[PDB]
Design a protein around this ligand. Sequence first.
Ligand SMILES: Cc1cc2nc3c(=O)[nH]c(=O)nc-3n(C[C@H](O)[C@H](O)[C@H](O)COP(=O)(O)O)c2cc1C
Ligand code: SF4
Ligand code: SF4
Ligand code: SF4
Ligand code: FES
Ligand code: FES
Lengths: 87, 39, 210, 428, 262
Amino acid sequence: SGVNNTKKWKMEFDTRERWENPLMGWASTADPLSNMVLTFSAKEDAIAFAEKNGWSYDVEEKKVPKPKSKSYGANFSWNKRTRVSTK
Amino acid sequence: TTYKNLQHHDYNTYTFLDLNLDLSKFRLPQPSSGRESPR
Amino acid sequence: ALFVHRDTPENNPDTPFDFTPENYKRIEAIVKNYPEGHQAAAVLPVLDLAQRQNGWLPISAMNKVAEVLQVPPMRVYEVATFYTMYNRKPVGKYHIQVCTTTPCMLRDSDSILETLQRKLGIKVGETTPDKLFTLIEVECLGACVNAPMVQINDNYYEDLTPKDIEEIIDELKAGKVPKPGPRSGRFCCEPAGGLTSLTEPPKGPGFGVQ
Amino acid sequence: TSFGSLKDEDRIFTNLYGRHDWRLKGALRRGDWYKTKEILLKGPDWILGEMKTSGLRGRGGAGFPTGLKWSFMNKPSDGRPKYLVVNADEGEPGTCKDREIMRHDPHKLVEGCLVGGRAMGARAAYIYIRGEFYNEASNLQVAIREAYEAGLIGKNACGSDYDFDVFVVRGAGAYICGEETALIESIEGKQGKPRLKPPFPADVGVFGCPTTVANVETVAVSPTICRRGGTWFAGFGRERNSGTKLFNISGHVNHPCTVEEEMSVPLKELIEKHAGGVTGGWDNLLAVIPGGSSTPLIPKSVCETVLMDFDALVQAQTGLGTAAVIVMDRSTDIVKAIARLIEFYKHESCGQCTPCREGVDWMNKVMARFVKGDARPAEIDSLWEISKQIEGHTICALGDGAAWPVQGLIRHFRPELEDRMQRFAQQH
Amino acid sequence: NLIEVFVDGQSVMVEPGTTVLQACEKVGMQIPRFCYHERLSVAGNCRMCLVEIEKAPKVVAACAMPVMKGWNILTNSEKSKKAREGVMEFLLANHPLDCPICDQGGECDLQDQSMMFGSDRSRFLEGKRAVEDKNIGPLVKTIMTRCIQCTRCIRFASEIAGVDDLGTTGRGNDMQVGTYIEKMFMSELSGNVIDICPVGALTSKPYAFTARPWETRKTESIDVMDAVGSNIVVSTRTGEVMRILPRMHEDINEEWISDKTR
Ligand SMILES: Cc1cc2nc3c(=O)[nH]c(=O)nc-3n(C[C@H](O)[C@H](O)[C@H](O)COP(=O)(O)O)c2cc1C
Ligand code: SF4
Ligand code: SF4
Ligand code: SF4
Ligand code: FES
Ligand code: FES
């Protein structure tokens, strides 16, 4: 339930071939970038870096929670349906 | 003088409920939450 | 103790149980003490009632109560495990229980507990093979003044010593319904021997009035 | 003044020892149900002002001014009805008083419930008692049968048009249920588990309907206050500790007893005047428990010369509660006594609060080790720190009830423990 | 209609019927959590959400208390940190030493909160407790000597899935959480108590014993088992799938997904 990860803006690459070695069974790769994750503090700056290095960027906008009204006392209500059968 | 509350030595294990059953004729109608139940 | 259910051949949902018609009368009268909706308060006294109809509370009884009151049965199981008096395991004829809390203790509940154990031959946490007397040690019961006391099925017996309890025990092993109350001369709660209060009669309805 | 030294004409709870009858007849004779109709006419505000003038405080637990506790609820209604509840429960070790009040004075209790419901514009009163008190619930239900059949209760209360109802309830053998909120929850059928303050029963609670809670003694005395004047009552007590009181003396005493008395009275006078004297000789006395398990002990140096009231006990670092005076002497393991007192809680803690559920048992085990000294000292300070961790970080006062005894035992009687430990080490 | 607060001097505007914790969130300071989940009801069992309230002595629980105009809150102060230390000492008194085995090894809210807000050792030279394990289904592997008794499962069930079979049975340390019988808690939504129970008590049987989180390269995808659009986190390992998780979309799946797709 931690929220010190949903603070940054991260740049990753699409994935690529990731097969199994025949000798023992490890996982190899033809691409070096697969594990190149980069940090940023702003979408504008990230976009600047991306379009600067020339790649083709695609965004995933921010999914932010909503605010809610937790009138605890409601659990112990009279007319409502919220009334729980537990404690 | 002498202890007086000796009218329960014969109170079996049903008297409270028999009394409730009798009083339920003298009680008043309980309020209605306008509902079946909160489920 | 245990707070779990293993379906033995004696305690299973098919176990025999049912609510008599007069029990149903009492049910209706009870539930008519509470509002339309919020008709679950019946649970506690209903279960005490089923206990009085048969000393022990089985899975089948719980399910029957839940179906009667139209309630999820876990809200019955929770209660049956929470409260004590609700006997979930079979009980004998006399559900003896003795206070061990500090006052009764320092006024020697231990001697009487020991004499009771020695008399019935059996130890706390079990009963006779004939399934007659179930002994327990428990906490306070409201007799913290007539300290050394007991409870049996519904009545108390206070301010007593090993001789007194042995007498009562043989008296009960005989088919007797003894008289509920202290057994050390005192009547209800007064200081033994003599008094210092309520010696003079009371005053009249109108007194000290504004 | 030297308080106490009371008159059995002012002592209220007559028939205490059941030497008279407890029916409607003997009650009317004693002075029950006198112009209750005129009172219902006078209405709530006058009653509340009378109680405030009296300055009464509460018996159950800490002293919360009843006048304010009830003004909280004095209010119009919005369809949501309003209920009263009576905490007849009695499990706090050393308390045998409400049981007597009921089996010997039920009509007065009903009268008080009625007056309180009228003050709060109520509809009914739920009297919640334990399960072991089947005889008492029976006597009380019988008295209510008589009252209904007479006409002092129900549709027409006593001649007015006030519709009031009384209902009785048994628990199942729990103690926590004697708490202002888990009581309500047990009534509703939910497990006997408390709630969070806020919100408060005085605005939200039982069946989601506003309600008030009250102790049997308070509800039973309020009518006598209202019909006698209040100022006279307050005159029998100090500025804040006003009123008479019930005491229950038990333990190491020639003649244990239940008694009525005045507030702010010397404990020494109390014990040596009634009860026929302390056992084995005063000097054999070691310490006391003036409020049952919900309070910590105090040794000779303050058991003597002290008063008895919420204030001047707080100053003494303790509380009063139910006035369950236990007494001991130099013949008991204080440690074994207190360890059993704490195992009581370890058995009768509901469990939903983490500190309760996981610290009460810690305490019980560490004290069971202290019993035999198979430990080492600094566990003492560890336990003290645990208690200070628990105190405020819970819901119901039971946390303080479980901590306070240990705090007092360890602020007073450390050398006993230290010597037990050194002696056990000697014995290997 | 608004209401004011001054946290650490810092000011905030909120609504009524609000909570200390939602305010501290509006500001940014995350408050601890054991018995809270924005998509559930509220209780005060855990008692780790405690804070200090300037001008008032006693601590409160920021999961239930509604904020009163003019309060200065204090989160990282002395009484608060001490409360948390004590509370976690209590919890970890009995939580057995199954951290390695516990499939929730690197994601354990309790691990993290002990490492950060708790203390550095236990003053518990005493014995622990254990409890029987329950069979509840072929999906939800139950160990129950780890339930800190937060009640998340209970509330989630009794509210979302309308099951009404789970509950607490007992009082004191002897308490347990689970049906009183060998019933089966199978439902289209059984399979989120896994993500909700912060501890590794209700683990997933298939994934169990197969891998750990940090090893994984969490990619992001969706579901096709139904036409809903449940955003999903697909966990990889050395070029292979190992587990599936929900992904928070406040509209479509809202931190809940189906047994089938997972
Ligand atoms: C844990 C606990 C147990 C209690 N048990 C009893 C009891 O058994 N009998 C009683 O008369 N009061 C008991 N009380 C006192 C209650 O606090 C009281 O009924 C109510 O909360 C306050 O009512 P009052 O202000 O009129 O005294 C208990 C309180 C607590 C916290
Ligand atoms: S402090 Fe203990 S007894 Fe009181 S509500 Fe919390 S867990 Fe229950
Ligand atoms: S939940 Fe798992 S990782 Fe966390 S403390 Fe318990 S055993 Fe250790
Ligand atoms: S099993 Fe998990 S979710 Fe359920 S009460 Fe215990 S810790 Fe909370
Ligand atoms: S001291 Fe034994 S009943 Fe309370
Ligand atoms: S988060 Fe507040 S007590 Fe659990």
